[PDB]
């Protein structure tokens, strides 16, 4: 009696998934990088570890981060000595912090995106929440539904423990949700808080120490939908194609385990080298089909895992130095905010493009690429089209 | 120059997402329920807690579970006294177990589904992995890509810490991935291992004790795709519509926190009552549009959180006793396997329907419903169409 083909035709959307709003938020505590080596070796009781401190100083000076925003303060750290050691039982304390902070910080970004979008929050049909900072049941998705007053029937996607490539993952996911469901409007929230990874220094664990120089806190929210209502909704970027891959010869490059002492961070391989050696393949797969081979002719968003990733990618491809401007500006002002980073970079790029009177939201160019890099070694690729004005 | 509308038309699939294969697996250790009260009070050193033991005996006798499959053995428990206490530091040990067992057990189910499907594993384009048992970076998705030899460019969706409704969530997700991407073939793996939740008994925590009577281990895998190749691929069920909602007046009904002592389990409200009071609304939303109001005229798959959920739902709706047969058979033989449960029930239903010469894979009926129930209180609804033969 019932036609499933009719139902399917009527149920799906028509156009490309489009980013219609972007809002960001960060903890109020601003931590300068210039003075971080002294602060960090003092709050973790490691002033006697002189050679290690010099190594950290060099890491921080080479980081290309001016400041980061951190939920953790000196007062919180003084009440949690176990978080200040390299390896002490402290997950319960860290979970107590991030179970509340992740949704709190996410709500601030989401309210900003919803205001920019300008449409009723009751029209949000899908919610994607992503964090690498803590886990809980009901998750941060349920908390954000409650905090924001979304409809109880919002369709939720709780992305936990994903790592630094997940800014690309939430876009890859939102694309399918928006494009396959007529009228769908997806709220996407990436909210990352370093209270689960912060820990004291150890001279036999320099990889962990690198994480202490680079990771910072922040949340970014998007509204994504197909078939934007012309002159009511305002397209910013369109997604056209996505991919995810694991680079060869990268087993164990980046591992992070959630333990009784919190989330540990290890680096066993040359991440900048692996990314640089495999970025061309990723570009060819995405852009060969569009007939584009000049990678300076597209706009760039790259997860700034560290400055060396960016520097080696630029060197490998012969990118003009300006291609990574928006990426490096976010790195400089906020550090590596894991999954939220690339979403801050999209916001920086469309704001600077609009502010400076360029012709599109992608620096005056039509096509662009967004990359996420993280454990596996995983590379996420999102091909974007900019919007006029 | 480039047409995004042409790209979008060429990139998407045409028909409904279809389940094309189902395979399951369980740990080899079979634990009888009849003798479980004695075993459990003996391995946890609680034989002196006589009134509590009587309460557990009654829970087990009312469970309607004959046996469960458990990775944990007496030998493993004797090497882990901290797992045998109600509340002792033991997450590191539990994580070490499940980081390996979840992907191992998932691989066994996946290999069975892939064999049934019969097509090259290189045609798997998307991978969804779901577990409520442990977390790691790279996740179980990366481990299963490696173990199975999937292509490194498989698009992965790592569903961690979701809870008991997630059998419905992975179907809701697979539907969009398959339907919006031409040629996509999604491997879906739900793999649940109770080593993170097992713990000793406590007389002030009877809700936790209920979990010890009900949860068991197992993994189920699916191949999902749109546009099946006729006579090469073999449709089993088609997905037509999905929903997810949070029941009113259910805040805190089911909470589970991942702590230094592992995953705790709490029940603060009447779950069978909440599900029963809200199941009609869910059915009306799904079936009003199809013109169906007789809920005995559709085939049923319900997450068997406990037997009282099933009993009250049946009573509420006046379901014939046979509607929940396949659900109760899985409950009886395997217990509550969290997200994988409903996927075992689909397998039981299509096997018994085929075995007994019925006209469709949905007990001879055309339309059906699958429900997941879990933290939030969340209800997941999936409307299914059966296949002839």
UniProtKB/Swiss-Prot annotation, chains A, B:
EC number per UniProt: 2.3.1.74
Catalytic site: 164 (acyl-thioester intermediate)
Binding-site positions, CoA: 55-62, 308
Gene Ontology BP terms: chalcone biosynthetic process; flavonoid biosynthetic process; polyketide biosynthetic process
Binding locations of substrate: 197, 216-217
This protein's record includes keyword Transferase: yes
Entry keywords, A to Z: Acyltransferase, Flavonoid biosynthesis, Transferase
InterPro entries the record matches: Chalcone/stilbene_synt_C, Chalcone/stilbene_synt_N, Chalcone/stilbene_synthase_AS, Polyketide_synthase_type-III, Thiolase-like
Known catalytic reactions: (E)-4-coumaroyl-CoA + 3 malonyl-CoA + 3 H(+) = 2',4,4',6'-tetrahydroxychalcone + 3 CO2 + 4 CoA
Keyword Nucleus: no
Family in the record: Belongs to the thiolase-like superfamily. Chalcone/stilbene synthases family.
PANTHER family: CHALCONE SYNTHASE 7 (PTHR11877:SF62), HYDROXYMETHYLGLUTARYL-COA SYNTHASE (PTHR11877)
Assembly information from the UniProt record: Homodimer.
Protein name from the UniProt record: Chalcone synthase 2
Provenance organism: Medicago sativa (Alfalfa)
Gene (UniProt): CHS2
């Amino acid at each position: 009696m019932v036609s499933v083909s009719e139902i399917r035709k009527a149920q799906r959307a028509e156009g490309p998934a489009t980013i219609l709003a972007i809002g960001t938020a960060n903890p109020a505590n601003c931590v300068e990088q210039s003075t971080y080596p002294d602060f960090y070796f003092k709050i973790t009781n490691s002033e006697h570890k002189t050679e290690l401190k010099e190594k950290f100083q060099r890491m921080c000076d080479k980081s290309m981060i001016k400041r980061r925003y951190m939920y953790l303060t000196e007062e919180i750290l003084k009440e949690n000595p176990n978080v200040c050691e390299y390896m002490a039982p402290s997950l319960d304390a860290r979970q107590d912090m991030v179970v509340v902070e992740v949704p709190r910080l996410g709500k601030e970004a989401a309210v900003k995106a919803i205001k920019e979008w300008g449409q009723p929050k009751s029209k949000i049909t899908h919610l994607i929440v992503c964090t690498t900072s803590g886990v809980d049941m009901p998750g941060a998705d349920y908390q954000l539904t409650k905090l924001l007053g979304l409809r109880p029937y919002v369709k939720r996607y709780m992305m936990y423990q994903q790592g630094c490539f997940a800014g690309g993952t939430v876009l890859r996911l939102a694309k399918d949700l928006a494009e396959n469901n007529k009228g769908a409007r997806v709220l996407v929230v990436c909210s990352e808080v370093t209270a689960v990874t912060f820990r004291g220094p150890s001279d036999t664990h320099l990889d962990s120490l690198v994480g202490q120089a680079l990771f910072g806190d922040g949340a970014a929210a998007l509204i994504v939908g197909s078939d934007p209502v012309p002159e009511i909704e305002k397209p910013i970027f369109e997604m056209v194609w996505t991919a995810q891959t694991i680079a060869p010869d990268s087993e164990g490059a980046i591992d992070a385990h959630l333990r009784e002492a919190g989330l540990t961070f290890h680096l066993l391989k040359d991440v900048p080298g692996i990314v640089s050696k495999n970025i061309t393949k990723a570009l060819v797969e995405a852009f060969e089909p569009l007939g584009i081979s000049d990678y300076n002719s597209i706009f760039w968003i790259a997860h700034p895992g560290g400055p060396a990733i960016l520097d080696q990618v630029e060197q490998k491809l012969a990118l003009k130095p300006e291609k990574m401007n928006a990426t490096r500006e976010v790195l400089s002002e906020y550090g590596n905010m894991s999954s939220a980073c690339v979403l801050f970079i999209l916001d920086e790029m469309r704001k600077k493009s609009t502010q400076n009177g360029l012709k599109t939201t992608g620096e005056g160019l039509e096509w662009g690429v967004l990359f996420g890099f993280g454990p596996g070694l995983t590379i996420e690729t999102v091909v974007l089209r900019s919007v006029a004005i």
